[PDB]
Amino acid sequence: FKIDRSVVEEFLALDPDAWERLNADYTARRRIGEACRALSRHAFVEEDPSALEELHDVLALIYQQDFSGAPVELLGCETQPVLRDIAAILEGAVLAAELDSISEEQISAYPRSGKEYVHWLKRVIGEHPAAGHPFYRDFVPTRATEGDFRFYLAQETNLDPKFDDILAFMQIGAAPDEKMEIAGNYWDEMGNGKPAEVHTAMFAHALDALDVNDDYIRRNLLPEAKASGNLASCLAISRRHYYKSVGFFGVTEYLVPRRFKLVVDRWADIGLPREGIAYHDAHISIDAVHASGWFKNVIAPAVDRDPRVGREIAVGALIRLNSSQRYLDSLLMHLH
Amino acid sequence: FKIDRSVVEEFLALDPDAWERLNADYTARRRIGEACRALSRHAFVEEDPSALEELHDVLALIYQQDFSGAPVELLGCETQPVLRDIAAILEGAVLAAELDSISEEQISAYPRSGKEYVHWLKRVIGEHPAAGHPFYRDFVPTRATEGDFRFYLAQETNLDPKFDDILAFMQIGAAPDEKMEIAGNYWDEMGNGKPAEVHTAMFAHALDALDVNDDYIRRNLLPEAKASGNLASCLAISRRHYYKSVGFFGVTEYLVPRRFKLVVDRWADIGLPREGIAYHDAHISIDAVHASGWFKNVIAPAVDRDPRVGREIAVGALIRLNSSQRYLDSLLMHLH
């Protein structure tokens, strides 16, 4: 038995009683799981490109269930026993591959107090090539066209359109000072109560301005863009990945202002309609404040409360930097 | 093989490799699951009281993992394949028992438009005895002492201390108008950014004023109080339970002001320190506004977008009313 996206699409078409029958059959469930381990070996041991993309298509389908409002026809379907087993196996493989690129020395050299840890992490981030990647630093200001921006935006639907729920997942069970800061960030994502300022709505207008429609996305989303979006989902939805998540989305806010300023300046230079980039324009100043509060009010208190979590936050940071590097190199490659 | 709380506590003590070994063994996992079906039969077919309380002790332990910040020693432990199978089986049994008390006529008679649906639901709520239960209506104003309030508050640690995360889970994937209202409710739960006004912090002070400490809670929490708290967890954490959740927490906000006004007035009459009930005092006016916005901005738009969800919201409402009735009758019974 083999597992792929269409197989999981078929599961998701089952009726509630068919789901109850599948859930009761630990023989069909063992087979599903062994099929997942086989797909994982192909993707990461053999590094078969089509298997890796199939694995991320499967994860993306599952996370779509975790993050999306359920449709009426599905409300009775108990999908957790099977879909969580699939996710745990493929996730476990995605994350072991990320950690194979991370050395013990990178994540153990840190000062064991909050304010000091922040200086260290910013230096560590600044040393990584993704922090000044040529896609933003060289390609965008000198070459990017409408069609380049359209292709680029298609890749970015993996992350920005779900920041609000990533934050809502992350703050579950968080210590009070960390929860307060994440809460305020979430409330900003929701326009501080004003629908016209909701960040995902403003991001949808950028997609509108360039016709980044659902066919274009599905046809053009790169495998590294899928992995990026799946990594963010994976880390946000498990409580045990919280500290990795703190590092991952901490790096995310920190890099936005430099990246978006290069994007908006070129967008104007090539005459594109400026209300199209209200999202990126706004985030230049918003995420300067988000990044500052994230370091000072999430990362520093976590390290001060238990310095052992500094290692988890560093891992999460490096997972974001490495995956962003692979995604940006792949993007720049396709754009040349 | 039998399953109970201590068995699941032992799972949660396993190291990451022991978890990986358990997850790979679909024979041990089939046994765990059959042990869950057996516990479920005892709890709900035989209605053995100790089995029902054991089932809710197991669920409460699992939800504690879902809602609580993970400890450092546990960050590497892949608990989802087993704990989600346990939860799906015991949850499925808890919810079938709730639905056995709900007739098709109760949840199908509703008008298929939003504003009309709200009037109907309020009438349906007002017809249920939990909406004017003698614990609040008769016992509290005439008899409640310090020790009664202490016992009562111990039961209420099942729900109020996690409203913020219940709301954060619920709004995942919600349609925009519904998400905005849930978001604003969450931001109120977080003191609108002011730590002294965070609702769970103010609720902790009420517990402090009466010495509702962790031993007292563990020794005194009633089985119906556990079921109440597990029902709220169950509905909030699955996307497919969203509309039931909307009905369940809609009833919750709606009933708070009448209930809390009876509590605070007696609290003052018996001379208890009034800063102890800052939480309940505040919520008399806050949840009047929360309930109004929940009907107008969550329930009415959901029904107008797809009237089929009116049946789910009604189920969730009746699940809250029925479970509250059983919990309040059990409480009043123990207090006499």
Ligand SMILES: [Fe+3]
């Ligand atoms: Fe944003």
Ligand SMILES: [Fe+3]
């Ligand atoms: Fe931000």
Ligand SMILES: [Fe+3]
């Ligand atoms: Fe509240």
Ligand SMILES: [Fe+3]
């Ligand atoms: Fe409220």
